[PDB]
Amino acid sequence: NGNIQVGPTGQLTIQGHPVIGEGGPITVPEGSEITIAADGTISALNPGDP
Amino acid sequence: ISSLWIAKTGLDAQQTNMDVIANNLANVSTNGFKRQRAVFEDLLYQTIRQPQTTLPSGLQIGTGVRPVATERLHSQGNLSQTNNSKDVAIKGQGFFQVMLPDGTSAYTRDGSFQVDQNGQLVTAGGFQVQPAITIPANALSITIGRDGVVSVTQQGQAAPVQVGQLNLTTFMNDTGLESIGENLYIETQSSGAPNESTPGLNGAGLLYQGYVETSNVNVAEELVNMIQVQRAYEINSKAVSTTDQMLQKLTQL
Amino acid sequence: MISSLWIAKTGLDAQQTNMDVIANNLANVSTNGFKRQRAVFEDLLYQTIRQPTLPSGLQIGTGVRPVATERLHSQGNLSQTNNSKDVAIKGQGFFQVMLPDGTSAYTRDGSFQVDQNGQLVTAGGFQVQPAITIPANALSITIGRDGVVSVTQQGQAAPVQVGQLNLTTFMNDTGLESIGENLYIETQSSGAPNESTPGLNGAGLLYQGYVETSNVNVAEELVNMIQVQRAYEINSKAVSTTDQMLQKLTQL
Amino acid sequence: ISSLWIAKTGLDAQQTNMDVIANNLANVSTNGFKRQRAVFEDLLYQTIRQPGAQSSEQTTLPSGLQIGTGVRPVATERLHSQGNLSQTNNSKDVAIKGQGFFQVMLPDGTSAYTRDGSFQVDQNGQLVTAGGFQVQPAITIPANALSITIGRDGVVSVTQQGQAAPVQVGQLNLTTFMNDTGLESIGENLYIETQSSGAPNESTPGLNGAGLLYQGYVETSNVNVAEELVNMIQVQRAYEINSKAVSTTDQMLQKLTQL
């Protein structure tokens, strides 16, 4: 079920369960425009940042 | 009798799906509106019996489905020109802040503002915009730039006089805002504490004067989803009918 | 009871009111001193379903509701009527007339006439409040940028000034209550009117022999009609599929 | 069995709702017609046993049996809003703005009040409504009348052959009520006073809350067909559901009596 959600503090939570990747389950910045690559890489762009 | 409850849950899930679809369709021409989609999930599974090459011979009965959440797509809608001098549209993220009569504060997205009798700028409905922008009388024109600065010119003035700034707030997780009626949202624990900033800085949006943000509702998606909802409802009713036939035959004999 | 029918009903009502205001705007496009209207909609209350730091909550909408209608108090174009007693306001302001009952009303459509007693009235019989009186044997009537109205007479060189056309201004133009015959009456939303001579305190100027037209953009109205027609049809389809679903359910 | 009675009450309520919807739809072309809406109310409830003791170290559900009885139609209210105006170019037709009712004289001797403005002239000159009921203020239009003009106020004038100045012939003052909804409706678009509506008060148009008169226009009915269609669908579905309930109760009773 690839329906990921972001909490207030920036945790990728699927139905209340944090997603697990290599080297720690998951963590994202506060409000970045999340972009997920074709292989799994999660690109992050701080809003307002160039 | 379990099948009856399972089919009842399925029918209720389809009913709520149709409800959100109808709500999306109804306010298709509401300024600054965001579509919603409902997500369902499975219930608990009863493990009746634990499990050369044959089938595992294990039993695991499901229970049904319930609606879990309704997510709003905080995307960017198209901009339509109203030619008014006091309509603003947001390019990017951010919410205007208004003061509720009881005392707390709410946050909105659409821009359609009027001027009260005392002169302050309020929304359509009488609620006051929080930074308290006051527009004096004998105002020849009003200008709201891409920044938060709002200026008014007067008779025989070489340069305009600034009469305030429209700072706007942002949230860490804008999906978690609880949406009370009347095109308003309130801060909840799911969303972060709001942080205010001038437009164009700290990740906020930009202000376009004379335009309004239309709803981002895709009608074709709604129609296809509606067809699927009707067909699934008709399929699920067949389960109830067949279970009724089984029970009637059992009671008869 | 069915949940989705009463939502599509509200949607249909909203689209109907939208079409109503569009038709009203289109109908009086040739009237003078008219301001177009826009209706603003909003959704109704939301019902929250309670579950046993959730990323989001379960909430269900109820429909849409028209909350208000505003008027764009911009400046329309001018048409030259070649008359000598028609005034067009350049800027912002409102002429004050007196209703027969005794109250005061405020208008913008300037096309005036002279009654049998010689005064200045608007088309309809209502007289202008400052009570301009033009005597008989009037060679010509001139109204300048200011409110001064002068009348020339035979055998005299110096024109005789008869009155001044003070116009009133409001804190909030959009708050004025509209009645028939292009007349507005003050409310609490619009501040108390203040008199002003033309060209002062932000009040507009006066042009004689010109009439202000309506600020209606027909090109926008046609596309709005297309949109409201399509939305009405889609909501109708939603009603129809709800009916089909309920009919399938009830024949069980 | 009480279930049949409850379902019968529900079916009757749905039938009455469909009746009022059909009545609203039928006279959608009637001039000065105010649409109706039926409001119901549930009957009493029989408490077989009162709730016992609870919330004592337990989270048990309250064990209280309170059976319903059904539903009855409690009222039918009309919405005295303002309808749209249609042009007829007939100089003897008056449309009314705001609130008010023209007062007509019923043949028996009493008086009724109406909104339908479309008047004609009898052989004697008196102004009557479509149906012969004379207007109570008794406006008489003389012969050889070039044209009849009724202003925004209630004054009615007629220009003669030679005289330049029009001659006043009467005033069409109109009545107002404290509660317009409580008027008792009869045929021919007539309302009669009741105890629910206060005593009528007559006044000239434009004063004391009275309306204004437009000559040559007719007020249209304030019926919204979009509401009516969805109401029809809803009442049909509710009727079908109640019929299903009746069928199920009948089947279970028939199963019982086969014992």
Cβ pair D208, D51 in contact under 8 A? no
- The verdict on a CB contact (< 8 Å) between A8 and B202 is no
CA distances from C38 to B5, B109, D167 (A): 49, 19, 45
Residue C32's alpha-carbon distances to C75, C81, C167, C213, in angstroms, are 12, 12, 18, 5
> Are the C-beta atoms of C59 and B178 separated by less than 8 Å?
yes
Q: Is B68 on the interface with A (CB under 8 A)?
A: yes
How many Cβ atoms sit within 10 Å of the Cβ of residue D35? Answer: 21
Query: How far is C237 from C159, CA to CA, in rounded Å?
Result: 71
User: Which experimental method was this entry solved with?
Assistant: cryo-EM
Give me the residue from B19, B125, B181 closest to C45, CB to CB.
B181
- Identify from D82, D84, D152 which residue to disrupt to test chain C contact, counting C C-beta atoms within 10 A and taking the largest count: D152
B238-244 long-range contacts, Cβ below 8 Å, gap at least 24?
A: B239/B3, B239/B6, B239/B7, B239/B10, B240/B4, B240/B7, B240/B8, B240/B11, B240/C252, B241/C252, B243/B3, B243/B4, B243/B7, B244/C252
SS (HEC) of B19-39:
HHHHHHHHCCCCCCCECEEEE
- Residue D199 is classified by DSSP as P
Nearest CA in chain A to C53: A7
C156 reaches A (C-beta below 8 A): no
B207, HSE (Cβ side, Cα atoms, 13 Å): 25
* Whole-number Å distance between alpha carbons of D107 and D130: 14
Residue of A nearest to B193 (CA): A8
Element at D253 (helix H, strand E): helix D225-257
Q: Resolution limit in angstroms?
A: 3.2
Answer whether C106's CB lies under 8 Å from C94's CB.
yes
Q: In whole angstroms, give the CA distance from residue D36 to residue C214.
A: 38
Structure tokens at D72: 């009855």
Residue D78: closest CA among D115, D116, D34? D34
Is the Cβ–Cβ distance between C93 and C198 less than 8 Å? yes
Tokens of D45: 């409830």
Contact between D136 and D119 under an 8 Å Cβ cutoff? The reply is no
Chain B residues touching residue A5 (CB < 8 angstroms): 71, 175
| Contact (CB<8Å) C55/B36 | no
Phi, psi dihedral angles at D110 (to 5 degrees) = -80, -175
Give SS3 for D21.
helix
Please report the number of interchain residue pairs, chain A to chain C, with beta-carbon separation below 8 angstroms.
9
Cβ pair C35, C71 in contact under 8 A: yes
Return the amino acid letter for A11.
Q
Q: Which residues of C touch B24 (CB under 8 A)?
A: 61
Cβ–Cβ < 8 Å for C206, C95: no
- Please identify which residue in the block is written with the tokens 């400046």: C75
End-to-end, the C-alpha distance of chain B in Å comes to 17
